[PDB]
Amino acid sequence: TTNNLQVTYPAPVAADGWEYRLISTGLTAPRSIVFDSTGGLLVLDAGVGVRRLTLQDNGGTCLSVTANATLIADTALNHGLAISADGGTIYASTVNDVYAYTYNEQTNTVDPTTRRTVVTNMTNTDHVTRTLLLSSRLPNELLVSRGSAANEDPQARNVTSGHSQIRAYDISTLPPFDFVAGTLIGWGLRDSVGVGENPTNGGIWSVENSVDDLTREGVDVHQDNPGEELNFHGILGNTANQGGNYGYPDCYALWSTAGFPDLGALEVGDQFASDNATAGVTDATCNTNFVDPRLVFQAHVSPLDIKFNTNGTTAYITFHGSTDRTTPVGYSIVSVAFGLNGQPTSPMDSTTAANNILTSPDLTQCPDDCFTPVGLTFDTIGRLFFSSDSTGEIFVLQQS
Ligand SMILES: *[C@@H]1O[C@H](CO)[C@@H](O[C@@H]2O[C@H](CO)[C@@H](O[C@@H]3O[C@H](CO)[C@@H](O)[C@H](O)[C@@H]3O)[C@H](O)[C@H]2NC(C)=O)[C@H](O)[C@H]1NC(C)=O
Ligand SMILES: *[C@@H]1O[C@H](CO)[C@@H](O[C@@H]2O[C@H](CO)[C@@H](O)[C@H](O)[C@H]2NC(C)=O)[C@H](O)[C@H]1NC(C)=O
Ligand SMILES: *[C@@H]1O[C@H](CO)[C@@H](O)[C@H](O)[C@H]1NC(C)=O
Ligand SMILES: *[C@@H]1O[C@H](CO)[C@@H](O)[C@H](O)[C@H]1NC(C)=O
Ligand SMILES: *[C@@H]1O[C@H](CO)[C@@H](O)[C@H](O)[C@H]1NC(C)=O
Ligand SMILES: [Ca+2]
């Protein structure tokens, strides 16, 4: 490599058979990342806009950033970033709007005047990120995620508010869509920041940042509950397993049974009534009217992205890390094994489905001396790249 970048905190530990390298540093707050057609890495640097890193590639993890330009300067862009399959359009989001920009791959420039607003009316308080995903199987379909306005948001009970949900938009048909004009992929999703497509079948998957301060029969159980969730939303362009309500704010998934008041026949993975559920809602109601997660993960690990490998055998998820637990959790990259039907190989009650790929050597140091993984992407040869927003870093990760 050109440069020898090193981390400034006790370094991530790779599982056996993996290796990594830090390749960019001094970014402000890097969120979503994607490759352009010319081998450049586009970085949604929150509060700055979209930056393009030029990389030199000597094979394996031997990559070096040789240059960087700001393609789009806009301080409102806070997370979401996508690029068309032909490479000629960039989509990026603010709290309120999803913009499309023409991207000139001959120059590697974007003319600001080319900006059009494709989706709008998304603004709300608290969860302000708007994850963008373009389908591979249906390349005209743009998915957009949008969280709650508060930890327990009552407007998430009203589907027309557009809070706590994922929408799909046919961009080929485009005066922006209104947020709630899109096909409904899911609602009752508090903050499903990570959304991905499994190539095995085009199955749509999201990962949930579930509720804080969880009380159960008035007892505080927030330390180990509720679960973070892997949720399944069917395939794009069909309604099976899609558009349902995944619980929030009425129902939450169970991670840890021990010391859980009013367990009943509840198992790991099953949802239960929130103490603050609307008048009438019970556990049976959670069981019959709301869509359960397909897997759960350790409470508060805070997943932010999910990406599958070319073959669909494995998904990789970023765990950005807990902020409210006495002993912190997350601060890792994990993988989840998937089968031929495009479902996880683990049962929905498993507590061991997340396999560690890259971890913080000592959780007691986090957040302050730990990476906080956010964005993931694959290059053309299957190498995995990821962002760490709080340390201003980009890493490459691969099997050795
Ligand atoms: C259901 O709704 C209730 C009511 O909003 C939520 O209760 C909140 O629980 C937290 C405990 O984590 C309370 O915070 C604490 O308040 C006391 C004062 O009594 C203070 O000494 C503590 O340091 C802490 O700030 C919070 O006040 C309470 N909120 C209220 C009464 O407004 C509960 O978390 C919700 N249940 C869920 C999300 O499962
Ligand atoms: C993007 O490019 C700029 C231009 O080279 C880099 O800015 C230099 O950064 C180093 C940081 O150690 C300074 O010593 C130089 O003075 C900077 N030069 C200028 C002209 O500002 C910047 O580091 C690059 N950023 C990333 C994230 O790669
Ligand atoms: C539902 O959502 C829309 C939000 O725009 C609003 O017009 C309506 O009054 C809301 N409340 C309901 C149906 O309870
Ligand atoms: C946003 O919603 C408001 C209603 O509050 C409406 O005036 C406006 O037409 C919407 N914008 C678009 C582009 O749909
Ligand atoms: C798919 O991807 C991974 C990485 O190449 C590999 O370990 C796995 O064996 C592959 N599966 C199939 C069915 O080819
Ligand atoms: Ca749920």
Residue numbers in the entry: 27 to 200, 205 to 430
What do the study's own words say?
Here we report the biochemical characterization of the AA12 enzyme encoded by the genome of the ascomycete Trichoderma reesei (TrAA12). The three-dimensional structure of TrAA12 reveals important similarities with bacterial soluble glucose dehydrogenases (sGDH). TrAA12 preferentially oxidizes l-fucose, and weak activity was measured against d-arabinose (11.6% relative activity), d-galactose (5.7%), l-arabinose (2.8%), and d-lyxose (2.2%). Based on these results, the AA12 family of enzymes is likely to have a catalytic mechanism close to that of bacterial sGDH.
